[PDB]
Design a protein around this ligand. Sequence first.
Ligand SMILES: C[C@@H]1CC[C@@]2(OC1)O[C@H]1C[C@H]3[C@@H]4CC=C5C[C@@H](OCCC(CO[C@H]6O[C@H](CO)[C@@H](O[C@H]7O[C@H](CO)[C@@H](O)[C@H](O)[C@H]7O)[C@H](O)[C@H]6O)CO[C@H]6O[C@H](CO)[C@@H](O[C@H]7O[C@H](CO)[C@@H](O)[C@H](O)[C@H]7O)[C@H](O)[C@H]6O)CC[C@]5(C)[C@H]4CC[C@]3(C)[C@H]1[C@@H]2C
Ligand SMILES: CCCCCCCCCCCCCCCCCCCCCCCCCCC(=O)N[C@@H](CO)[C@H](O)[C@H](O)CCCCCCCCCCCCCC
Lengths: 177, 555, 51
Amino acid sequence: PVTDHRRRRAAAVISHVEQETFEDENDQQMLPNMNATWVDQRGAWLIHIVVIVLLRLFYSLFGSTPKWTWTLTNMTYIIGFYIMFHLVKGTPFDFNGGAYDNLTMWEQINDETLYTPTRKFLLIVPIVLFLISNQYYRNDMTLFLSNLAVTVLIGVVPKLGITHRLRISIPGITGRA
Amino acid sequence: YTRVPLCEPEELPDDIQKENEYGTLDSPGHLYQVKSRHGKPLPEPVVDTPPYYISLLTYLNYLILIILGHVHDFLGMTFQKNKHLDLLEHDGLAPWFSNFESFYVRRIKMRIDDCFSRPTTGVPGRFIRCIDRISHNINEYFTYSGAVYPCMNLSSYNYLGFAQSKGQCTDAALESVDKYSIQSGGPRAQIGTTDLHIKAEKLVARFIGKEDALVFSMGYGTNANLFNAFLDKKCLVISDELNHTSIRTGVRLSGAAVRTFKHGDMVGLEKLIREQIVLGQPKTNRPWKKILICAEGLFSMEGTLCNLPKLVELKKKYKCYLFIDEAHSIGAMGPTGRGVCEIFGVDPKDVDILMGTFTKSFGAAGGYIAADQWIIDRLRLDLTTVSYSESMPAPVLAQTISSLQTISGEICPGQGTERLQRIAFNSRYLRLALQRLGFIVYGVADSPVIPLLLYCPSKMPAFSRMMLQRRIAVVVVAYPATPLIESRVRFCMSASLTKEDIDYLLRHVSEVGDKLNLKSNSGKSSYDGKRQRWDIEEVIRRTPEDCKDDKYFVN
Amino acid sequence: GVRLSGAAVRTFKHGDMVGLEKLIREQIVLGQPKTNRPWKKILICAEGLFS
Ligand SMILES: C[C@@H]1CC[C@@]2(OC1)O[C@H]1C[C@H]3[C@@H]4CC=C5C[C@@H](OCCC(CO[C@H]6O[C@H](CO)[C@@H](O[C@H]7O[C@H](CO)[C@@H](O)[C@H](O)[C@H]7O)[C@H](O)[C@H]6O)CO[C@H]6O[C@H](CO)[C@@H](O[C@H]7O[C@H](CO)[C@@H](O)[C@H](O)[C@H]7O)[C@H](O)[C@H]6O)CC[C@]5(C)[C@H]4CC[C@]3(C)[C@H]1[C@@H]2C
Ligand SMILES: CCCCCCCCCCCCCCCCCCCCCCCCCCC(=O)N[C@@H](CO)[C@H](O)[C@H](O)CCCCCCCCCCCCCC
């Protein structure tokens, strides 16, 4: 081959995305991403509170018990955020030649900067939501355990210094480099 | 019916046609002369924002659109496959394009596609003729009928009104056709070059103010095939985040390292220059062979000017090079029309390389590059387009030469200055009136592009269709071309329009905006720090006199 | 003399050519301290017979 541009699919229990070469990194990431730039903008922080309030009011319009309402709103918010950010990999529009085909939107925020204020806020929201919500279903231990498990396993572990560029081949042979 | 009809030209007297293409001035009081800034630097621009609920509503609308689009795609492509035969593998062959890489075009823009790709006919002058069409399914296919109606033109790149079929330029082009055929033998190296090429190059070099210049057939190829001639993998390019795709393609083909700085932020540029000079090349820390700075004269999406003296002093201090693009600034900006250099008074010797395009003002197709003697002498041997591509045709050369001579003043005296005064007055009057009504308008005081912000996505099709029903042509842009919050409508002013047309447009736009609730001004646009919600009659009566004064513009 | 000159000094073990080659390669690649610029020149000093 005169170019040697291929995608690898090495299989292992624990694997990481290899560091980009000179051409892919220093040259093919120069223009605004247009997929993660909108995070640090106007009105990008209150919208989460608005969504939480709207979900809580929509569930309360049904007329259910507070415990079920708050558990459902926590689960729905966390699952929606996960589906939006952590699950999908890529970008809806061609960037240069497919440079961002191995990373999620979370990794692309602020040009792969580990600690920025928006990341701190996004991590803080689920914890405060859990502390506010648990006060209604403390009596039931099963629901408390379920809420704690959802929060820790979905809304806490991915947003960590570890598990950055971390892939597991259990649900499918992932692609690295 | 499905195919686009071929329209037979209409028979009209001469005067009606001349009035259709170019207007006639009513009073000598509708002209303005542009001054030159000697030692006044450009102040930092100020922008205005709407209240929060607009942003929240926009975010909710986009969230709903994305959710329903993805759900529809998944359900439709899981429960049935006969209709979606262009997005699945057939007889062991992959599809042409991918599902995820074209989500937006198929799922959001396709429902409002009637606002794009509008067929027209005739000269694109003051009034542009359009062919009617009927939407079928959801903007899938169209049926055409033999009917053509005129519309007011606010969507064409015609600044000085050179798009005419009756004048000196048309006669020059016809004489050129009579003398030189439309045939071009081949590349300029082999047989292509003639005497008219040399005449045009010398005239362009004299007009711009540099030593020598070259000509090309396409503006895109001027940038796409230029940077590989003198750049390599050991050079650094610092460019604004808002540059045309041709520059990015040329730099990508060259292979040099690219670092970008935020628009209108000189401190970050200085910090980046210092850090890149200190650190050096990656993995080896050798010094950079050379450093080049790329910038554009006037930015079309915002109508803002670049700060030239700051760049000149920075490059002189740190020993860098400068590249300036003047697609939207040549022939329309400055007391005479030389460009931003005449506006700021900076000598052209400071800028190493200048570029331009003849499509936006001179009514032709081509491009040019202007530099010193030895640089051009080397680049002529080291370029790719000269000895591998075609050559410029003769009618385009004749049109360009006639337009440049007319603007310079050698022939047809008392025309270029009058056109420049017309366009300046029109731009200033429209911008001031729009700001006084209560809208949000970006850009400098004298810029032919007037962007008006329309935030909510559902307000673009409604505004466009209502304006089309009232015989006004507009252009709307949206995500991903523009930021998610900010979507805008762009106005391109001409020297062929008249104050009565501006009044007609102002009345209709004001009433439509009142209907759609597009007036959101926070008082930072006004120079006295108060909200402005005036009447149309009062604005029409007072603005034309106060349009000339420069104290009513914040920037 | 070298101390009065002011140049950088690196020493290699007596009768060990492999270490000398490794040191030469590393010093050519690395460059000057704190700047990683290439050395202007390199000089090798040795004695004929060691007393
Ligand atoms: C009862 C309850 C009710 C409630 C509830 O639960 C049930 O209701 C349920 C309703 C559920 C949703 C239903 C549907 C979706 C869309 C799905 O998808 C998004 C879009 C795509 C996202 O991106 C991927 O796709 C990128 C594509 O480039 C990949 O990129 C790389 O890989 C490239 C490979 O070429 C290389 O180029 C490079 O290495 C690189 O570019 C990368 O993997 C990854 O980024 C993925 O999907 C698309 O892509 C598929 C593959 O092409 C399409 O085809 C496939 O599906 C066809 C279907 O007929 C079949 O023929 C075949 O299986 C096959 O052809 C599929 O149709 C289409 O959707 C994401 C999940 C979601 C939202 C579900 C969430 C859970 C629910 C809300 C449940 C909810 C909780
Ligand atoms: C009445 C039922 C209940 C209603 C509630 C519905 C669910 C709402 C729950 C809250 C969800 C979390 C809220 C956080 C978000 C706050 C507001 C953000 C506003 C929109 C931002 C748009 C950004 C555009 C950037 C473009 C981009 O780059 N896109 C992609 C690739 O990078 C991303 O992959 C892409 O966007 C996500 C694709 C996800 C596809 C969704 C598929 C789900 C199908 C529907 C199933 C239900 C899901 C909800 C449980």
